[PDB]
Amino acid sequence: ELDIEFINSLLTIVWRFISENTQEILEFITAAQVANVELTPSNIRSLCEVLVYDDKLEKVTHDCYRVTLESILQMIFNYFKMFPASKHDKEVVYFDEWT
Amino acid sequence: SLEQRTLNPDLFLYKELVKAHLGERAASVIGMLVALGRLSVRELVEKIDGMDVDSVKTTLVSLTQLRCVKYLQETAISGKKTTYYYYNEEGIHILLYSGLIIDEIITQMRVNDEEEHKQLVAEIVQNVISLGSLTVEDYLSSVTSDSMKYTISSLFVQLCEMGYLIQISKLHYTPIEDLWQFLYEKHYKNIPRNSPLSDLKKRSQAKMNAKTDFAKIINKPNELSQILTVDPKTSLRIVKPTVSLTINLDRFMKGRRSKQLINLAKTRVGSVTAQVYKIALRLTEQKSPKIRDPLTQTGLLQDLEEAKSFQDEAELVEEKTPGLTFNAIDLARHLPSASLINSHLKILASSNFPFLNETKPGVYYVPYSKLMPVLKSSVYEYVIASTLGPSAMRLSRCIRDNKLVSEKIINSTALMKEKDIRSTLASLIRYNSVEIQEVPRTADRSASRAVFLFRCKETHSYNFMRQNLEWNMANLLFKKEKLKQENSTLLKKANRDDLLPSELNQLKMVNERELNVFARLSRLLSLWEVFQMA
Amino acid sequence: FPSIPLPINGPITNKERSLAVKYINFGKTVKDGPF
């Protein structure tokens, strides 16, 4: 809504809400001392399209939303627990330096 | 290393494969065939310098035996027969994957355990093609006369009838375009003059028949009714001993794509259903549709009314093939419960990735032609999220589904601050995952009075990502042999004995460090081969 | 001098440490063979 940050401080709330398993999404936000001033389903859909792009949730049946099980990645496609050597090592692979 | 990183295409990959494990004299000839296309021996010697005419033929028979080139003959009316020689792109990929087939026999032949040919069945693949071609008499006449090789000879019909041991022919050692022409000219001489009507259809009358010849003549190696000998003595069934056979890349490549796609399951579900999906996957590998599609290689892919038919009937091939549409009943005996067989498979259709989605009720099957386009875009977007910021994963998905985004709707659709989106989008023009589309609102296309639009352009982003990895495979291959040039005087001493107690340090720390390279190459090769399902 | 590495940077696992042995003796067969 407002252009300055703390947008994502509420998007962690909706993602913890669904991980246990769109009109119902409104009334969970009204409680729990949420620092809010105006809610509407037009906004919350635009608030929901953010995590569609991060693949933290999924869009099914045109209004329903499931978790993509990135909670198990939250806790080869396994991009943490791959720590580099990076020190005194010459034969390492870089993504740049071919352009 | 700026001398390397600039003026080296995939020619830098194909030059140093033969340079690694073969002599230097053949790295100069196959470097010339790729750089020039095709040329016969009468003008090959003019291009290279330092190789005699019969020394080319001695050099050319080396990569002949390992199937690293492909020949052609076309005569002239006035002249003699000219032997045009081409380059083989699939014969040298065998030399690339060569460490991985040894571990592909093991992960696919799992009926046996604690066998005394584990050291031998790992060697038969090293025996079949490191010699070049292979025939049956070459291993039975070895240093051992009997050695219970009647078990070993009957072991190979278990290992040939499961695939990738097809008898070689002139089909595998000629390319695909120089076969299609003279049969299209044979089918044109099959139908003569004496019909004037619809001559454009008469020119295509050979073309409808040459399609039926094309899929026929490529099954002649695949057809298994003439590759083994029924013999009523001392055995039951055995391969014909007079057969010259090598390995085949396709069922390895189809098995690798199937190995590539089960890893998408372990992400979209846990490990119970990931264990379920392996069994129905592995059983359809011996007869799966073709990955490389020799239909679509070279021919009438130009016009859409023919280019539609390259997947119209091909999807009808996949839908109306009997030997893969499993009943969903016989899966319980293969797993070491027709409720849980259907229930753990019911979540496959419910997930929005179309594997085990479209079917007939009761008999379900995994489609291919509308699946692997979704695998390639899923693996590529995670590479961007892995090596650079997660903001780019948000932006690249945003411009994907939202067609032709501008810079105002990009802050309506996504939510980031304005200063941070420049520091993430400008990393995507440099690597071509986004593009620019311009509208000149003034005269003569002036830039300050103009606004800019974006696009995905879902082919240019995958070509650049392909060749961003074909170089990195070969650059790691460049530091393979160049590491073995220093510390070479004791690599000869390590090869003349089959002991200075301080010199041995300078042989292990160079050998443990090159142990990392083959593991780093295998992971990148898994990252590269996804972009070959064209 | 260049930044931004690929994420394939791991100390080698013995699941694929045997896989790297099959490469070095493959070329040792072919180079010390006929060619």
- CA A89 to chain C, closest CA, distance in angstroms equals 11
Beta-bridge partners for B440: B450
Chain B residues in contact with C22 by the CB 8 A cut-off are: 99, 102-103, 122
Cα separation, B425 vs B433, in Å, equals: 10
Q: Which residues fall within 8 angstroms of residue B252, CB to CB, at 6 or more apart?
A: B97, B101, B104, B164
- Buried/exposed B508-518: b ≥16 CB within 10 Å, e otherwise: eebeeebbbbb
Nearest CA in chain A to C1: A97
Sign for the CA dihedral angle at B26, B100, B530, B318 comes to: positive
Cα separation, B23 vs B21, in Å, equals: 7
Q: Of the candidates B435, B434, B436, B425, which has an alpha carbon nearest to the alpha carbon of residue B388?
A: B425
- Length of chain A (residues): 99
| C9/A82 touch (CB, cutoff 8 Å), yes or no | yes
- Interface subset of A 9-38, CB within 8 angstroms of B: none
- Length of chain B (residues): 534
Q: Of the candidates B159, B149, B147, B150, which has an alpha carbon nearest to the alpha carbon of residue B112?
A: B159
Give the H/E segment covering residue B215. Answer: helix B199-217
Cα separation, B214 vs A84, in Å, equals: 50
Beta-bridge partners for B87: B69
Is B303 in contact with B375 (CB distance < 8 Å)? no
Number of helices (H) and strands (E) in chain A: give both, helices first: 4, 2
After which residues does a break in chain B occur, C–N more than 2.5 Å?
A: 336, 498
Cα separation, A92 vs A84, in Å, equals: 9
Residue that has been written with the tokens 């989605």 in this structure: B357
Strands A57-60 and A64-67: antiparallel
Q: Of the candidates B98, B368, B130, B353, which has an alpha carbon nearest to the alpha carbon of residue B254?
A: B368
Is B247 in contact with B165 (CB distance < 8 Å)? yes
Is A51 in contact with A57 (CB distance < 8 Å)? yes
φ/ψ region of A80 (left if φ > 0, alpha if ψ in -120 to 50, else beta) reads beta
Q: Of the candidates B471, B467, B470, B462, which has an alpha carbon nearest to the alpha carbon of residue B396?
A: B462
Give the start-end residues of each E strand in B214-342: 228-230, 237-239
Helix (H, G, I), strand (E, B) or coil at B504: coil
Question: Other CB atoms closer than 10 Å to residue B264's CB: what's the count?
Answer: 19
Token pair, residue B248, equals 């085949």
Give the start-end residues of each E strand in B222-281: 228-230, 237-239
Beta-bridge partners for A65: A59
DSSP secondary structure letter of residue B66: T
Is B171 in contact with B222 (CB distance < 8 Å)? no
Is B154 buried (19+), middle (13-18) or exposed (0-12) by CB count in 10 A? middle
Q: Of the candidates B222, B226, B252, B239, which has an alpha carbon nearest to the alpha carbon of residue B129?
A: B252
Q: Of the candidates B45, B318, B63, B333, which has an alpha carbon nearest to the alpha carbon of residue B173?
A: B63
Question: Please, what is the Cα angle at B296 between B292 and B302, to 5 degrees?
Answer: 150
Token pair, residue B295, equals 């239909």
Q: What is the CA radius of gyration of chain C?
A: 15
Residue that has been written with the tokens 């120089």 in this structure: B178
Cα separation, A89 vs A96, in Å, equals: 17
Residue B199: phi, psi to the nearest 5? -70, -25
B372-387 and B460-481 are packed helices; what angle lies between their axes, rounded to 10 degrees? 60
Of A47, A53, A72, which has the smallest distance from its Cβ to B398's Cβ? A53
Residue B159: phi, psi to the nearest 5? -100, -10
Long-range contacts of B88-96 (CB under 8 A, 24+ apart): B89/B14, B90/B249, B91/B66, B91/B67, B92/B14, B92/B17, B92/B18, B92/B68, B93/B249, B94/B67, B94/B129, B94/B247, B94/B249, B95/B17, B95/B18, B95/B21, B95/B66, B95/B68, B96/B17, B96/B525
- CA B103 to chain C, closest CA, distance in angstroms equals 7
| A91/B390 touch (CB, cutoff 8 Å), yes or no | no
Is B271 buried (19+), middle (13-18) or exposed (0-12) by CB count in 10 A? exposed
Chain B residues in contact with A52 by the CB 8 A cut-off are: 397
Instruction: Write the DSSP assignment of B400-445 as a string of letters.
Output: HHSSS--TTHHHHHS---HHHHHHHHHHHHTTTSS--EEEE-STT-
Cα separation, B235 vs B160, in Å, equals: 17
Cα separation, B174 vs B177, in Å, equals: 9
What CA–CA distances, in Å, run from B166 to B157, B219, B266, B316, B489? 11, 11, 33, 26, 43
After which residues does a break in chain C occur, C–N more than 2.5 Å?
A: none
Q: What is the resolution of this structure in A?
A: 3.7
Strands B69-75 and B81-87: antiparallel
DSSP secondary structure letter of residue B244: B
Query: Which structural technique was applied?
Result: cryo-EM
**Alpha helix ranges (H) inside B284-337:** 304-307, 309-319, 331-334
Is B409 in contact with B421 (CB distance < 8 Å)? no
Cα separation, B182 vs B184, in Å, equals: 5
Give the H/E segment covering residue B54. Answer: helix B53-65
Token pair, residue B210, equals 């040459």
Residue B75: phi, psi to the nearest 5? -90, 165
Counted across chains A and C, CB pairs separated by less than 8 A come out at 31
Helix (H, G, I), strand (E, B) or coil at A52: helix
Residue A74: phi, psi to the nearest 5? -70, -60
Chain B residues in contact with C14 by the CB 8 A cut-off are: none
